[PDB]
Structures are given as structure tokens and as C-alpha cells.
């Protein structure tokens, strides 16, 4: 009949006049199941939000000139805009993100077409103003050029880059990848005009902090 | 059982199995079969 404390993750329990616990006869608390009824690895559940997901496809046609914008992605708000995405449910609690980013631009061009899209990365405080930047210089950014011919995929890794130490989930704070027309495509006839572009993203180095009520926004850095 | 020793105990054993040729037919003539036999003596003593 003494003081018993109990602590799990955030919550904690300080009890007075405790009673010794009970357990069923011959208990076995080993978590894993052997033999296995599931082939998956038991670390799946926490790992799951890291899964790579289709993101914001766009359609790039003839008519669009240079400097035009094919598609747009707001980076940090991109992985859970809806309830459908895997990282949503667990991001609907914790209010901050230290996470790094992995985005793989998928593209398919029918052989015999020529032109280029550029996949760049613009952080938020940069993204605030397009009007300042010369177009010819966008290659200063972390980026990858994509040739129509002989490029299936463009793999670019983005480390966390932002002013404040931690960034708010529900906002745009990480900025986002914007895909621009480096040169117009050239189509011989007959060919399908629209060349579909799908930005197939991912996420790595998962982090969350600073609990909040499920639906409510909270200010942190400002 | 996560822990089970590997022995003949996989197969739970059985009673041993045999086959009968003659279905209990008595044989008179042969002396060998005739000599052995059930005694109505107590503890079959001689």
C-alpha cells in the first residue's frame, strides 16, 4: 500500500494507496507471433507514414511556352491534404515537422518528342515572390533538368531547409516543388499532344512534436 | 508450441499392426502346433 507512479509517452499517473497488479496464469507477454500469421515486419505501423505517394499530376501540352508552369506542389501540406494519404492520420495530432523530403519526378514521353521541364525547389520565404527572379537563372536552385528523350525519372533529395527550427504541419512552410517549361515540346503528326506529368513523391527522416487538439491550429514560431 | 523437441512424438505413435493369414483354423495333425496350447491347470504347472 505505497506510492506507485506510471508513465507512458506523454501521459503519467501518480497513484497513492496502490495495489499489486495481477496477470493470468502462465502469462507470456512476448509481442511477436511465432509462428507468424503475417509476413510483414512488425515495425510497419510506425514506418507507414514514410510511404511514397502520388502527388499533384499535371498536363504539359504544346501550346504552353517557356517560363510557363506545368504543375505545382506545396511541399509540406502535400503529403496530407486529404484523409486518404498514409501520413495524414498521424499528422492530425502532432503540430510540428522536422522531416526531410524525397521526391521522384515521374515522366513519360513518346519517343520522337523533344523538350524539357525543370524540377526545382523553392523554400517558402523564397516562394513569397516570383517577380524578383530571372528565369534563366533558376538552375541555381537545387534541381534536376529533364530531357524529353532518354529520361524516365528524375530523382532529387531535399534536406530540411527553412528559417525557423521547426515548421508547422498544416501550413506551406517548407515551400514547394514547382515544375517549369524549359523549352516547348515538339510534336510530329500524328501523336498524342498532352504529355502527362506525375510528381511521385515520398518522405524520409520522419519527425513530429508539440501535441495539439486534433482539429485546431496552433502558432509556434511566429 | 514455439518450443517443441523434434522426436518420434511428431507422429503420436500407434498400436503395432499385423496381418492374419489363417483366420483361426485349428490344426490337428502337426505335432508342433499341437504341443503348445492352453492349460486348464492353475498357473500351468507340470
Amino acid at each position: 500500500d505505497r506510492v506507485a507512479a506510471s508513465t507512458t509517452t506523454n501521459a503519467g499517473n501518480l497513484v497513492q494507496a496502490s495495489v499489486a497488479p495481477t496477470m493470468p496464469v502462465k502469462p507470456d507477454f512476448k509481442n511477436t507471433d511465432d509462428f507468424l500469421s503475417m509476413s510483414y515486419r512488425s515495425t510497419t505501423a510506425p514506418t507507414n507514414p514514410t510511404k511514397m505517394v502520388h502527388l499533384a499530376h499535371g498536363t504539359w501540352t504544346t501550346n504552353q511556352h517557356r517560363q510557363a508552369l506545368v504543375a505545382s506542389i506545396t511541399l509540406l501540406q502535400a503529403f496530407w491534404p486529404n484523409q486518404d494519404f498514409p501520413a495524414w492520420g498521424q499528422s492530425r495530432y502532432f503540430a510540428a515537422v522536422r522531416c526531410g523530403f524525397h521526391i521522384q519526378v515521374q515522366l513519360n514521353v513518346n519517343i520522337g518528342s523533344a523538350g524539357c521541364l525543370i524540377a526545382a525547389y523553392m523554400p517558402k520565404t523564397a516562394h513569397d515572390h516570383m517577380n524578383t527572379y530571372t528565369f534563366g537563372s533558376y538552375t541555381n536552385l537545387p534541381h534536376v533538368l529533364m530531357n524529353a528523350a532518354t529520361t524516365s525519372q528524375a530523382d532529387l533529395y531535399i534536406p530540411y531547409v527553412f528559417n525557423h527550427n521547426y515548421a508547422r504541419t498544416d501550413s506551406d512552410d517548407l515551400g514547394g516543388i514547382y515544375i517549369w517549361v524549359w523549352s516547348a515540346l515538339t510534336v510530329p503528326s500524328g501523336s498524342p499532344t498532352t504529355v502527362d506529368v506525375t510528381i511521385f513523391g515520398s518522405l524520409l527522416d520522419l519527425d513530429f512534436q508539440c501535441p495539439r487538439p486534433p482539429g485546431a491550429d496552433t502558432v509556434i514560431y511566429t | 508450441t514455439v518450443r517443441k523437441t523434434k522426436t518420434s512424438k511428431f507422429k503420436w505413435v500407434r498400436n503395432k499392426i499385423d496381418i492374419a493369414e489363417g483366420p483361426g483354423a485349428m490344426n490337428i495333425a502337426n505335432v508342433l502346433s499341437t504341443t503348445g496350447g492352453q492349460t486348464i491347470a492353475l498357473v500351468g504347472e507340470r
Partner: protein, 212 residues
């Protein structure tokens, strides 16, 4: 880090494969199936024995044919490979060779002995060899009783083919019986089980026949 993985060499392992180069069909058996970051491939044996192994599966017998016999005349009874049962699992293979058990089950209201004899060649070897079945391997079965007698493989064709119905080389045999002891309504039921079968060469999975 922990979550991500990358190429470009091992994309074979992540499941990209060219079907145009299969090597041998048996070379695909060696192929390691693709796996993502989390899957645990572990072979878990719940039973000590394996029901998948060829030896075990055909140990379970299966019922082919039922007929009453009221007449002492020699009964021609032909054995096809199994249909509509777990024996039909054997339908994947053409060529088959191995000895096979026959479990016959005698039912006699009036006491009757019944005889069993098996001939791989049919009724006609070019002569009628069915004149008397005593010499061909007859094994006599008591009334209201059953026996496990197995037939050795005697054939002029080293490999029986399962599919075909052609009486010469196709079937797995032809079975002879006759009652004795002046009786009627002696009813038999006969079961066929393989022993240590050897199946050679596969075939595609057969169509179910609604029209027969």
C-alpha cells in the same frame, strides 16, 4: 536512412523482371521473389508432416465405382484416373509410373467369397486371357471383409499417361472380379490409392467440363 531504399543495380530484387528471358522454367523456381522494406518471408511449419509433398497427398485414397454383383460370371471393371476428387490433383501430369493400392470392400447379405485380380493389359492381349483369373495374381477376399492388396507395375509401356482414355496404354488398369458360393446381391465398393507415385512432365490446368 531507415525508411528509404535505392537502386540502381538491385532493381531486380525489388521486382522488376524481364519475362522474355526466363531461363529454364525451372530456373524461375530459384528466383527470389520481390520484397519491400517491410515483409518477413519465413517458412512456418504448423504441421510436422507436409500435405503438399507428392508422397503424402496421394496416400489418401479415393472412391472409384460401386456395383452389386449377383452373378458368378467374371466382371469387367475398368479403372480411369480420378475425376471430381482430390485425386484430380494428379491431372497435371501425363506420364505416371508407380505401384497402386486397391481397397475393395465386400458386402454380402448371403455369405459369399469374392475374388480380385488385376491386369494392366486389357481383356484382350491378342488372345482371351480371361478364361480363368486364378493364375494372374488372384487374391481371395472373405465375406463382409476388406483388404489392402497392392498391384505391382507390369506394363509394356514404361509410362502410363493420365489424360487419354485409350484402353491400351492410357488407363491405370482394368480390374477383374467374380463371386463364388452360389450367391446374389453381393455388393462391392472399390478404392484406389497410389503408393510412392512418380509423376513426369506437367500439363496446363484442365478445363472443367459442364457438357461432358
Amino acid at each position: 536512412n531507415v525508411e528509404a531504399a535505392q537502386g540502381e543495380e538491385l532493381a531486380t530484387e525489388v521486382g522488376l523482371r524481364a519475362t522474355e528471358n526466363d531461363g529454364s522454367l525451372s530456373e524461375q523456381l530459384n528466383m527470389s521473389q520481390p520484397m519491400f522494406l517491410n515483409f518477413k518471408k519465413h517458412k512456418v511449419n504448423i504441421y510436422a508432416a507436409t500435405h503438399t509433398k507428392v508422397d503424402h497427398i496421394f496416400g489418401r485414397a479415393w472412391a472409384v465405382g460401386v456395383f452389386n454383383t449377383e452373378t458368378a460370371a467374371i466382371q469387367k471393371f475398368d479403372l480411369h484416373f480420378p475425376t471430381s476428387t482430390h485425386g484430380a490433383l494428379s491431372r497435371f501430369f501425363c506420364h505416371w509410373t508407380g505401384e497402386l493400392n486397391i481397397h475393395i470392400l465386400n458386402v454380402s447379405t448371403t455369405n459369399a467369397f469374392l475374388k480380385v485380380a488385376h491386369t494392366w493389359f486389357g481383356t484382350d492381349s491378342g488372345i482371351a486371357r480371361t478364361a480363368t483369373l486364378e493364375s494372374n495374381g488372384t487374391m481371395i477376399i472373405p465375406p463382409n471383409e476388406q483388404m489392402t492388396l497392392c498391384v505391382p507395375y507390369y506394363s509394356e509401356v514404361p509410362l502410363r499417361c493420365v489424360k487419354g482414355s485409350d484402353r491400351n496404354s492410357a488407363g491405370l488398369g482394368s480390374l477383374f472380379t467374380q463371386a463364388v458360393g452360389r450367391t446374389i446381391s453381393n455388393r462391392v465398393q472399390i478404392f484406389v490409392s497410389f503408393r510412392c507415385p512418380n509423376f513426369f512432365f506437367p500439363l496446363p490446368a484442365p478445363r472443367e467440363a459442364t457438357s461432358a
